[PDB]
Structure formats: C-alpha cells, structure tokens
C-alpha cells in the first residue's frame, strides 16, 4: 500500500501554500487546492514571455495527448486558465499516479501571469467538478486513492513554517487529542460541512455551511458575521485599497470558533491578523465577506489552526487542534 508526505511552504504572509510535484521528470511548484478539481500547469504552449519566472511542463517530451480534449477554469477571485490535455506520470510525496490527466495551460489570466510563486494548481475537490471536456478526468487523489493504505489525505498548514500534506495515512503527532468527524455533502463537488453555531468574540449566532478550501487565503463569511466580528475591533474600517476590513496591527483580536458535530474549532485572534494591509500601518483582517454567496469558505486562516482529514469514506472531514 502507498502513503507519502508532501511538504508545503507558505508564500509571503501565507497568501498561498506551494508543494513540489514531479510531472514526467520535471518538478513544478504547485498550489494544492481542495476547492477545485483540475491539475493544470504552466507549459511550453504558453507565450515565451509568460513562461518566464516559472518551471514549465513540456508535453511533447513525455505526455500522451488526448486528441480533442480541452479544459477551461474560472476561480472565485476572477482568475482563469485554459488549454489542452495530456496524460503523464505525476508524483507527489513519493506517491505516483500513472496516466494522470495533466492540463497544459495555453492561456492564463493576468493574476496568474503576475504570480511567480506557483507553476499551476493541483485540485483536490471531488472529480465531479473537473473541467476537462468532453469527458472529465479524475483528480490526482482519485487516481491513486485505491492504491493508498487509507483513501484519505490530511493537511497541516502553518503560519510562516513548512507544513505537510499526508497522503493515505494520518499522522497523530500533528494534532492534540482525538479527531472529530463530520459528514460531507459532496453534491456541488466541494468538501462541504455544517457548523451548528459560531462564536465571534463576545457574540454567538446560528449555524451555516461552508467548504474546507486550502486554495482560499482567508476565512470568508456572511456579511452579518463579518460586521459582528469587526464591531468588536476598536478602529476597524473597510479599506478597498487593502481588500476589506483593516485595523491597527497592534490590536487585540477576538477569537472565532465554530461548533462542528460537538467539537469546537477555535481560530485564535492572533491568526486572524493576516499581516500588513500594505496601505500604511494597518493590517488586513483574516475574516472578510463571502460576497453574499450563501455558504462560507473555510480558507487558510481557519486551516492554520487545525489538522484536517479529508476522507473519501463517507465522505467525511476530521478535525483536531494542530499540535
């Protein structure tokens, strides 16, 4: 049976986490995203000026092209990418997927052309939302799941420290106590779960649902919740230059917690200070609006406080405080 550990590393301010992946012999730094199901990479099919600053995949060398297949993806932050498809060997933390579909970029939006920290994304959401056409393909995880010791992956994302992606096994030294599991609704292709209630510093409220997304930087919640939270932060104000609520970096922030199947997952106020807003001497809050979409995005801000198990049996998600 297989299992492996891939090490992730946060970029500046923990904006994103990158992990090396070897494709057909070439190592690329990818952003592992539990919010999507496409494995796409910068390739030699891109204009030479866009290959700059990146490690790129050369399909010609080792991939097998899927004639007539294309892919096109759009993310929540408005970025997008599109291209063609090849099958190749993909290795993550010593676990190799043979014949994995690799989406070679032909076009990338400005956000991607501006970010030299990654060379593409590896999606870990359910394969049901993979964008390959005419026939969708399976994610790296779905491709290898049957060969793992256990059909799950686990993640420990840290604040300005290397973290891990455990594939096929749980590392009990990564958390305190025992894990608590909750059921997942994969109907929209996400690792979606329910919270029974929340505590925002001195205020508590009713439950809601959200997705566990390693690919989103912040904790995105309903506007009501956001308001409630910053109403308790002396001098907090919205700053469009920064992207949301900002405050004095020295401010004492309240904790934020959610009740999940009887387990209280708490994000300490210190992790809610994202970092410099880069607009003077204010810091950006880790909690921001979800734009009225109807469900919350449990992004990296949240994940830095827990060890999370993504289990395909159920499916279910397990949580415990990071050790």
């Amino acid at each position: 049976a297989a299992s492996g550990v891939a090490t992730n590393t946060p970029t500046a301010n923990d904006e994103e986490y990158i992990t090396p992946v070897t494709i057909g012999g070439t190592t690329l730094n990818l952003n592992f995203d539990t919010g999507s199901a496409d494995l796409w990479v910068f390739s030699t099919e891109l204009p030479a000026s866009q290959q700059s600053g990146h490690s790129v995949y050369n399909p010609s060398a080792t991939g097998k092209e899927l004639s007539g297949y294309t892919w096109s993806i759009s993310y929540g932050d408005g970025s997008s990418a599109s291209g063609n498809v090849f099958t190749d060997s993909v290795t993550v933390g010593g676990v190799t997927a043979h014949g994995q579909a690799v989406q070679a970029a032909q076009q990338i939006s400005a956000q991607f052309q501006q970010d030299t920290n990654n060379d593409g994304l590896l999606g870990l959401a359910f394969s049901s939302i993979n964008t390959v056409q005419p026939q969708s393909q399976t994610t790296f995880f779905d491709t290898v799941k049957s060969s793992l010791a256990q059909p799950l992956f686990a993640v420990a994302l840290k604040h300005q420290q290397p973290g891990v992606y455990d594939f096929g096994f749980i590392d009990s030294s990564k958390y305190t106590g025992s894990l608590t599991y909750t059921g997942v609704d994969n109907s929209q292709g996400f690792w979606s779960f329910n919270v029974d209630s929340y505590t925002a510093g001195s205020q508590s409220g009713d439950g809601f649902s959200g997705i566990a997304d390693t690919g989103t930087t912040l904790l995105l919640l309903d506007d009501s919740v956001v308001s409630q939270y910053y109403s308790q932060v002396s001098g907090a104000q919205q700053d469009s230059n920064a992207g949301g609520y900002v405050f004095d970096c020295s401010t004492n922030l309240p904790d934020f917690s959610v009740s999940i199947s009887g387990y209280t997952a708490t994000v300490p106020g210190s992790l809610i200070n994202y970092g410099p807003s880069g607009d003077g001497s204010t810091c950006l809050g880790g909690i921001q609006s979800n734009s009225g979409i109807g469900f919350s995005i449990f992004g990296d801000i949240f994940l830095k406080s827990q060890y999370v198990v993504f289990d395909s049996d159920g499916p279910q998600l397990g949580f415990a405080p990071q050790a």
């Binding site: 904006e15 952003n31 993310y75 989103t216 930087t217």
Partner: peptide, 4 residues
C-alpha cells in the same frame, strides 16, 4: 489573497 486568492479565492480558488
């Protein structure tokens, strides 16, 4: 930050 991003939203992916």
């Amino acid at each position: 930050x991003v939203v992916x």
